Assembly symmetry: D2
Homo-oligomer: 337 residues x 4
């Protein structure tokens, strides 16, 4: 059959996932939705022409015997509650970041999932499904460059809104690097340090931008991550991994080249939504296919959600202290190995 | 509803389209199949776990009131017959190349389609859906380089089988360039000339490889197309369009870069099936979506099939004559404008 | 000692060579000059602060026992006369293109040089000394790509003056490709054909621009050379050699890259004089060093001058006829092997 | 006349400069040499066929009224003595790094030079004369990217000898970055911190390799410099400057590209001596031309030597302490502005 999916939270993110499941992907259907604003959920069912029940809350949606799996796409601080309820209802769950707002909240989810005996929770770190990152992972797993030693990366954005604050550089922005890098190199984070260059003219007075975040792993890999969210020129993700015997680097997004007016050039995307559309499609298709074929999910795990929560909190601490701060992680359970 | 598709011809190509419709794309289902070898069609229904009727021939399949659209993926010389039957049965049809084996056969299809009053026929020239070609088309349509003047392109393949013959360099290989280029520049072909370099050591004695094909358009654009099907190093498509004021060029397929052992490098694909998988997915999704949203197809047309048939025949003539040969095209009907 | 050089022709080209010998290179000095306009030669001696005698003509300059070698940098049609006189006077001679205006004139020079028993004549085809071309030659000589099969090249210039005529596309412009390519692949030219695309809006009404020149070698290498002298965007030399097993390509001139305003770009030079300055320096330094160390010159030869004269004439014939034209070359003497 | 140069120290470095002055450059001659090993100096005069006097020491060489300028190319710790003697003898001096082994020694030279009233001392930081760095400087001076904010750079070498020690990563290797970067951005260094990744398998047990050096300028520019001297793959210099509105990056050294065996690649040099040969030539030619045309030198100054000495010492301190260390610089004299 089609995997029958319910959606908890019908804002921009939920709508985009509803659109991809309904109009782009294979093997699933939206059969149920809920939102805090019931009127909004009804509008969504109408706009996307869904054959779906509108439920007043997640408890009633999760009680629907004909819902197999849910997307948790509500307000971030509301995610944890729905994830816990879904685990208890024994539904598969795809949770947009964050899994929970604290390490403790992630640990509550971890404890309950481990009881189930199979993986129900996939966290929405879509970078792992981007073709460039998949290529990097394959090269590393094949020992192409020997042991990784250093990672140099950048997350650049053209401009941010007036409400974007210093902490969000790590909470909303660097969190993607935080998830993908430890996955690439199969190592755990140990410490973080934040350094502030000269503030850019393109940043509002309350915002510290750019920033450099230096992260060391337990194995001794050193990551230097630049975050510059008012770079003006484009939305740009760059990542180079220096190994003992060679160096691998993430590609530019594909663009025709142009020779014109004394310049040889390619395009730089301006819109972050154009950068990872394929990865979002693949991540959800993987959720669907893994469930149908394996009876459990296969992507970033609740434990990856925990690592992101602990590490982001340490980075925010380091933003304030100017000192090297410890990333204190519990031992990874065999369940998540 | 799901668009209900029947498949005529369940060989490798038909199977791959069945796989994408069943497991990758949105909005369609395989409800019927037929193959000359009925046992093969039954095996296909079983292998892909289809809920589909096996019909003994295309006439019976096309008589099924619950088939909305068909794929024609049979032996090439058999395509024309099924396309004509499908038009008469008023079904939408996606036809793999060729539309027909002769200009005359394509004209028979054109005459019958024009009677219908809407487009039923989409021909499987998937290059138009490749992101690089879409980018080229957008640049041209926006006048980025002024008038196109010259096109330099190459279609390279690592090695061919013992049964690949000189004519197939244009019939099976260059036909893709033949379709995409006139579309890019909105011009008609007027003449073709073939020049043979030194034969490669990598080619079998009966095969002329490489070849250069020089094509001139009515507007005066000159295309120099290299075909080298035993290039050894990779499967490689290259295309540069020189305009009055600048030059645009198709990108390399996306690859991580590597610094190792004194070389800075990216990957070249070895497998043509890895080069255009995304384009095949997009072309079929467009077939489905166009039908459901517009009630007619929107891709390469029966007329494009005709242009390909006329032009390939002229190229094969030029391969034999060593002279400049005319491409004689009827006026394009308003139906296809 | 310093090699004592006399200069015959003190126009722009002669002045630039005088400047490089006097202010940039090692091991030579300008001791004598002559120009048709004696006042101009005197001004040159003063402007460059030379310790040099001004002679009324080349005969008197060549009679100076203390002149070891001469540069022939006069009006093109005047070159042949001075080269012949210098050979008879037993001086080494560096001759700017052309060696002579006709195949017959080049053959007169060849006959007289062969009598000398050592190479006196170096022709000013500086591309052979450009680092990119040297790299191409090394790769070819090391069999990196197997046998060369095809060459795709372009010679592009931003705009030309009102006096630039169709024939000059081959006589003044393509002549550089004509010299360098047969050297790269160690093959002789056999035929040429000219094809005219759509005329560019950037070309004046009397000029055919762009042009494509197709040249076949005796060994069966096919060269497609684009000439576009009003391309607007830059001065740009491109060259790709397709071999049996791989492909080599001339590099872009070195430029920093820029990410800015949605584009990732490098520089394209606008000024042809910036493209080959290093090659001009190296070619003259080689003239000097070869003479001092070997007692004979080592660069492009009088025979290379002959090949250029024959081939340019065939191309101009082909420009007019629209037909394939023969390049008729005498057998290369052992003297020039 | 030719600038008459004496050479103090005829080892490998002195010999290479003698070779370039004698056989490659314009306007100077080697008229005098001295070495601690007089037999070595005599051999050098013979090997290079110099018309030069061999002096027993630098005092006697500097007393030669017919010596205009000297190269100081002796053992590093011996440089300071000869530079001071040359300033007192009122000769122009080109000094290979280091200017002196301590900040105090550099300050002694600075004090004596300032008395002269014109610049006599040029320090051999050749990177400033490399075409890529010149291009970076021009872009910065033209405000192409707005204010520089961050610099990401790497100095990589394939392997080092058994005698290469941890301190040399900054003293001999990073010193080049240390000189060029403050010049590029016209800012002073304020602090340095060293971080050690996982040790490479390619490094001997006594050596800490790779290393990351984080340098902050007074203006707030943050530099992250990777040093990896056993990277195996090549000798490789990389440098990216992130500005407010865009990013500029040093180019790869020019190389033909190759498509072969499934890879599209360019060359990475293995030999550091091939990386900067042009810069060494240009730096010495500039020394010669500046003296002859301006009567004083124009390259990196004694003050730049001082900055390098102070900064290298701070980096070595940071290598040992693991803490952020201050770079304590005296105010730059107007003499050196
Ligand atoms: Cl919270
Ligand atoms: Cl965009
Ligand atoms: Cl999980
Ligand atoms: Cl614990
Ligand atoms: Cl047929
Ligand atoms: Cl492949
Ligand atoms: Cl059609
Ligand atoms: Cl007609
Ligand atoms: Cl003449
Ligand atoms: Cl320029
Ligand atoms: Cl010669
Ligand atoms: Cl003969
Ligand atoms: Cl010392
Ligand atoms: Cl090398
Ligand atoms: Cl100084
Ligand atoms: Cl002080
Ligand atoms: Mg853009
Ligand atoms: Mg590969
Ligand atoms: Mg420019
Ligand atoms: Mg190499």
């Amino acid at each position: 059959m089609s995997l029958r999916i319910g959606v908890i939270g019908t804002g921009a993110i939920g709508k985009e996932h509803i659109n991809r499941i309904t109009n782009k992907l294979s093997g699933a259907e939206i059969v149920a939705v809920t939102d805090v604003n019931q009127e909004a959920a009804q509008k969504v069912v109408e706009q996307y022409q869904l054959n779906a029940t509108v439920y007043p809350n997640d408890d009633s949606l999760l009680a629907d015997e004909n819902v197999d799996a849910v997307l948790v796409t509500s307000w971030g601080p509301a995610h944890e509650s729905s994830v816990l309820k879904a685990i208890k209802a024994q539904k598969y769950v795809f949770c947009e970041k964050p899994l929970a707002t604290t390490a403790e909240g992630c640990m509550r989810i971890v404890e309950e999932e481990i009881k189930v005996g199979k993986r129900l929770v996939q966290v929405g770190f879509m970078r792992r499904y981007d073709s460039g990152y998949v290529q990097l992972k394959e090269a590393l797993d094949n020992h192409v460059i020997g042991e990784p030693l250093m990672i140099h990366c950048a997350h650049r954005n053209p401009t941010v809104g007036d409400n974007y604050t210093t902490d969000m550089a790590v909470v909303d922005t660097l969190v993607h690097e935080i998830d993908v890098l430890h996955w690439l190199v199969n190592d755990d984070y140990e410490s973080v340090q934040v350094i502030y260059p000269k503030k850019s003219k393109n940043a509002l007075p309350h915002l510290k931008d750019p920033q450099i975040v230096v992260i060391e792993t337990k194995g001794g890999i050193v990551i230097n991550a630049e975050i510059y969210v008012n770079c003006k020129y484009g939305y740009d993700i760059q990542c180079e991994i220096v190994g003992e015997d060679g160096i691998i680097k993430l590609p530019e997004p594909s663009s025709i080249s142009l020779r014109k007016e004394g310049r040889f050039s390619t395009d730089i995307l301006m819109d972050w939504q154009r950068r990872f559309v394929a990865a979002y499609d693949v991540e959800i298709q993987d959720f669907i296919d893994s469930i149908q074929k394996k009876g459990e999910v296969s992507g970033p795990t609740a434990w990856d959600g925990y690592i992101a929560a602990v590490t982001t909190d340490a980075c925010v601490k380091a933003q304030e202290s100017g000192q090297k701060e410890k990333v204190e992680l519990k031992e990874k359970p065999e369940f998540y190995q």
